[PDB]
Write a protein that binds this DNA or RNA. Sequence first.
RNA 1: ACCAUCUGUGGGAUUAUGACUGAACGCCUCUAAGUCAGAAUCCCGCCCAGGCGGAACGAUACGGCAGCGCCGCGGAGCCUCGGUUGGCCUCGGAUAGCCGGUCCCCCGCCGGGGUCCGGUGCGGAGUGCCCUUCGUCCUGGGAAACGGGGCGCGGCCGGAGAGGCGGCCGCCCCCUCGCCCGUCACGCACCGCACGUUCGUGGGGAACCUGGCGCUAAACCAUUCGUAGACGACCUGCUUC
RNA 2: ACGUCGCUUUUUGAUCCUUCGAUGUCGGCUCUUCCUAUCAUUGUGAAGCAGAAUUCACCAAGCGUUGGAUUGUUCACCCA
RNA 3: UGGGCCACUUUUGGUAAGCAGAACUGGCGCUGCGGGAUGAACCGAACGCCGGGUUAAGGCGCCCGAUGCCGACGCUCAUCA
RNA 4: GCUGGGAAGGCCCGGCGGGGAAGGUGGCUCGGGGG
Lengths: 201, 352, 109, 139, 190
Amino acid sequence: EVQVLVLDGRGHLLGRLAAIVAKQVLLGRKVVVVRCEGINISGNFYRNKLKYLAFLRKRMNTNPSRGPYHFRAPSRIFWRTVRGMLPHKTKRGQAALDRLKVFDGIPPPYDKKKRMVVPAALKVVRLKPTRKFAYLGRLAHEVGWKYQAVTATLEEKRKEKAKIHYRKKKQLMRLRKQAEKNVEKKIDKYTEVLKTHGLLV
Amino acid sequence: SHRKFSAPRHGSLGFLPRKRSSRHRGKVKSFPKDDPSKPVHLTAFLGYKAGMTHIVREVDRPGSKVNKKEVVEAVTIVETPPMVVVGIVGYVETPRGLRTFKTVFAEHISDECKRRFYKNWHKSKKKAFTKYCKKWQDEDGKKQLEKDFSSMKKYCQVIRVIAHTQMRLLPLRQKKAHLMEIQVNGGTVAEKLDWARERLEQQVPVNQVFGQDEMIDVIGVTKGKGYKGVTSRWHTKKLPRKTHRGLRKVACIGAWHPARVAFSVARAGQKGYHHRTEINKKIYKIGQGYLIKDGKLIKNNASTDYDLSDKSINPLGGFVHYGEVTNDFVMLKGCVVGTKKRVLTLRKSLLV
Amino acid sequence: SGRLWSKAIFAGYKRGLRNQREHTALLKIEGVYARDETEFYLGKRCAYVYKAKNNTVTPGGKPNKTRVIWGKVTRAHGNSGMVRAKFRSNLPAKAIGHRIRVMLYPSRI
Amino acid sequence: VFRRFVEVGRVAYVSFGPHAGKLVAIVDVIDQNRALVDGPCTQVRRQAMPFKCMQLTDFILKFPHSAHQKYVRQAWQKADINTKWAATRWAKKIEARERKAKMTDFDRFKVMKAKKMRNRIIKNEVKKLQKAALLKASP
Amino acid sequence: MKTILSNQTVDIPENVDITLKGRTVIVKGPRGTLRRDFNHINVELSLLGKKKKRLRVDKWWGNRKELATVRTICSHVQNMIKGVTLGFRYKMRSVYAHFPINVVIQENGSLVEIRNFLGEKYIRRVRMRPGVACSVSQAQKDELILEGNDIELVSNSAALIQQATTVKNKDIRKFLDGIYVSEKGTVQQA
RNA sequence: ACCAUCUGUGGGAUUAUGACUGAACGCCUCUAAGUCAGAAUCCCGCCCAGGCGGAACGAUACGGCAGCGCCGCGGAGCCUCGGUUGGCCUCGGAUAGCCGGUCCCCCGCCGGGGUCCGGUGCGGAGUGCCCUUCGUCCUGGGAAACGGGGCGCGGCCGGAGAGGCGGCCGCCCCCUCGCCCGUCACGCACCGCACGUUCGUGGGGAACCUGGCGCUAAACCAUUCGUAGACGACCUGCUUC
RNA sequence: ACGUCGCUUUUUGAUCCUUCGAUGUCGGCUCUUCCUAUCAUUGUGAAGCAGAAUUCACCAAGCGUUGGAUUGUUCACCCA
RNA sequence: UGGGCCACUUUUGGUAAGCAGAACUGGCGCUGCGGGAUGAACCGAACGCCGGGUUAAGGCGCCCGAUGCCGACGCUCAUCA
RNA sequence: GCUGGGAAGGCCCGGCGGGGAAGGUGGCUCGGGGG
Ligand SMILES: [K+]
Ligand SMILES: [K+]
Ligand SMILES: [K+]
Ligand SMILES: [K+]
Ligand SMILES: [K+]
Ligand SMILES: [K+]
Ligand SMILES: [K+]
Ligand SMILES: [K+]
Ligand SMILES: [K+]
Ligand SMILES: [Mg+2]
Ligand SMILES: [Mg+2]
Ligand SMILES: [Mg+2]
Ligand SMILES: [Mg+2]
Ligand SMILES: [Mg+2]
Ligand SMILES: [Mg+2]
Ligand SMILES: [Mg+2]
Ligand SMILES: [Mg+2]
Ligand SMILES: [Mg+2]
Ligand SMILES: [Mg+2]
Ligand SMILES: [Mg+2]
Ligand SMILES: [Mg+2]
Ligand SMILES: [Mg+2]
Ligand SMILES: [Mg+2]
Ligand SMILES: [Mg+2]
Ligand SMILES: [Mg+2]
Ligand SMILES: [Mg+2]
Ligand SMILES: [Mg+2]
Ligand SMILES: [Mg+2]
Ligand SMILES: [Mg+2]
Ligand SMILES: [Mg+2]
Ligand SMILES: [Mg+2]
Ligand SMILES: [Mg+2]
């Protein structure tokens, strides 16, 4: 679509979410992924940590400053995973990669906006409940990431402000339900039209 | 095949961009960890390497061969005239790091401080902070200044004060002052802003930052040596005299494969003028500096309770390639990076 | 007073992995994510509308910078709602991931 | 935690497959994945059926396992499921979802008009309640 | 093979009540409150009786590995009932050949000082887990009494003491010195 | 110049291993679920460099017509770049469970718990919701009338993680219109036809006119310094007390 | 032990695929990096582990593994 | 032209060899194309310049055309899967 | 159209019956609950 797609990274498997996001950006869609620290990877944590430590070992022996760049932030880790699923050495792939914005936590532009979910990449449906998984935030923290604590504090601040918004939203909805009861005689004419056509059961 | 006999590599790879420092002052790069339990204090200072001398003291180290024994010890004199606080910076912690939130500068910024803002003070018209100082007097500006302090008090985690040295007290040719952000530690953000606000435009002597016989870190830029070969830069073995095209070289700069010269091989380049931090430098004395109450009092600089001689720290004929030390000074144990009259940063120890 | 056309995306040309047949294009129509739903769009006129630098004549209007390459949906591609389209001229590769309009003109309903 | 159970006589709603949208009764269970399934009053003859296409309802019939279709129909007709099903919120959401899909262009226009008036009257009254509740002057 | 139902019931005594919040068992006996979650196990917990207080654990369609968790939860719950009704008491003996092991109990039985283990000058400081109190018994010369409500915490506190007094670089079969858990039991003896 | 002298550092997850609780296997068991301790290893810190990566702040060009900034959508236009064709302004989350509402208790008038009542193939539903565009003229009934709309002003509050946004008052100035159902006719009805319909007063660059409010600086070279140096570069000084 | 299964490419063969309009052919010196099949050091398990010493094994390549006489030697041998 | 080489199978020497030597058919050499990521010899198929339809071998998370099927039944947790 | 001239299946409470049982209904017995 023409609008930006904002996806919540919590509870989403890394590769499965990256595959969906990669095809979306190749189709001209702007995608924003927030809470990349909440992304999950299947398999126990130690095993997934070994995979990144093996990644850390791959470096140019002659000059590591030129070699593979190992990004430790969860947002950049997810960004690199998507980059491995795009033709990033062509102009089409670079254009697609520039349509992806990745964030740790939820920054102020997107904290006030509704966030989508990809069921085909969710851990609850894609992974057996008895299997072990790893958190991208924990994996990032123990391999070099430096902002797990500050992101946690800011995410806790954001959650407190969101609860206040939800209580106002719930108070507004309660008032709307009371309003519907109050004006029922002057509404049943239009209520009946809605019911005949499947709206407002 | 393997090298016949083992030998440790020459030089450290922790200092690899063996390049000229991008800065001349020497930045702190790491302030002591802040805990609000401690009283509000400053963590850094700027001094100038005046020179070196040696002292005689009595060692109180039990179980040592030098216990209750005289020793002599080389010391470095770092002239430390008082800082002047001319601003406050606030920082906010972000998932991308610390970013500068808001900066407030005091009224009445000294000329020596304002010289730092210009590349040609001679041709300049001294306009820096001329329109900013007016907001300290009008009512809209003061209200905006109070909002800036309030926003710092509620949004910033660490604050720092911009302090500058006093050139005209120094015997150097340079009149341009040195500015440094000095972190304020030990207290709530509100407490350290109130502390910093009341020190604006004021002087902070080196007494209020450092104390006697405490261990500090010295941050500065080493002496420049120009462009040097591998024998001086990396202290590799000199080749035998019979070598055809030169013996002050590294014979093998790599194997056939990986087919490139590696970053670990010793190669000619800049030596010196590198940024370095040395930790665990003990303060042997903080000198009072010259005073005039009725007459010129020079005693306290180099008089000891055993010596009792009216002599300054200045050697006979003056500190060579520096001048005469008149202000406060810190006497550090041992040697310190940098040439004479090289600006040094003194930082509180990060260790316990 | 209304959009009057369906939003579609020029995903790419009909192709193997290592061979590209540029005469026909694969379009992704919004809201059509299964092959059984592509029946409505078969034979529908599709247009790639773009702008250029020089003015061109507009049918029933003053000349402007809008150009168009017309086409039509030929058949369904795959099982997930893609359709194949033939345009009078092969679509430029710069239009991949951009808007294609499906006109509804040749209506069978 | 669990309230609805696969059992003999349990009435299930078919979500997809050849018999989607129908009600069936579970007559017997086989191999954990399939069940012997019979809807005599809903036009589903006895046959195997995966548990994946079933969605259990709250209705349980009483008949022995693997009983003949006649006895299942008698149990289905007595305390009839067809009328009880149609009275549930589950069924009338299915029906409402069906009539909304079959709504024509004219019906869409009339719904758009009715929804417009209904929302303006409701949203007026919300403002009035808000303004009234705003008069809170008390220690 | 997947088994349809694997179930097992524990019997709750009268003086203790159990409250379920999903797979979070709260046990409220006379000696305190024990709380522990089992969200890592996909089981169904139910309070059955209003008169006898039965707690039933059910696993539906479980494989061999996850049928093993049915009795594990029941055993853990039974330890909660045991802990909040009788408590858990671990007795540790300090055995030594030459150097007597001096044990000093610091604040409220939460810190244990081992001085002269094998005659070395290093001081062992072992911190008890929260809710676990250590004390020196008045019955036998060399005993330590670890008392608490959670068997997990009391036994792990005892293991911390035992593993602190570990002989190194010697023959452990000859140098038997250390503090070892003598018996495991309860308080109130009922 | 070890041929003199000075300085060289903290944490985390854990390996091997040793254990706790504990089934499988009414016993046992370091393991299956769940826990503990754990290192010249590993990662980070300290330290070196600092992205075709950001931030905060300062000063921002005349004594003569001479450059610039902000405010006006102020106007008339040029050159160039094209995309797009309604919006959704947010609980936290669980999944062997959830969501909503209400009386007592506790927290200084709202949240937090305990009852109780509902919903749950999610209908307080993103398979959703909101807005909905032909325009006017007579003309009645309903909705409202405690209303609408002012790039009208003025004031205030909230938002810092990238706040670049959102909200509330006071005064003023206008419509009784705008929303639903009807009466009544009209508008280029351009004679079957495409790029129509929006964002949009779009972005960017020169330039003209038109008013108000404002500003009057630096950098580099040359010279000097020698804390620097192959050359560049770098640290410095140059009419005031 | 008798047997039997492998691994390695730091031995030496076997082959002759590349190079004969040319890839400078031993050793040493210098210098960097890598491997582990670990000599030492860190943390451990085992013993025919009393202690001391030693041996076997595990995680483990962070760090170190030297000065000399004879020999062109690689190797070798001895001194310390 | 009279240097051949490779593959299934048979087959001699050799511990073996991308070694050496035979038999048979096919191939590469002389051959492009689809697939095997990549590749003389493998699998499919051999070729004038094109449009439409359909396949072979091979595939259908994303790169990268095609499962975005409410695919079926099981097996498997690996601190070198 | 063919097939086992399809196999099953639906209705006729299928009726006169016979036999077999069990993934055992009612009843009965034993063990645990709600007035
Ligand atoms: K060598
Ligand atoms: K347009
Ligand atoms: K060989
Ligand atoms: K050869
Ligand atoms: K040759
Ligand atoms: K030699
Ligand atoms: K020699
Ligand atoms: K011939
Ligand atoms: K011939
Ligand atoms: Mg070696
Ligand atoms: Mg020579
Ligand atoms: Mg037991
Ligand atoms: Mg020993
Ligand atoms: Mg030395
Ligand atoms: Mg273990
Ligand atoms: Mg631990
Ligand atoms: Mg050649
Ligand atoms: Mg050559
Ligand atoms: Mg060569
Ligand atoms: Mg090993
Ligand atoms: Mg020939
Ligand atoms: Mg021949
Ligand atoms: Mg051969
Ligand atoms: Mg040959
Ligand atoms: Mg040939
Ligand atoms: Mg031929
Ligand atoms: Mg061929
Ligand atoms: Mg091919
Ligand atoms: Mg391959
Ligand atoms: Mg063809
Ligand atoms: Mg493929
Ligand atoms: Mg595809």
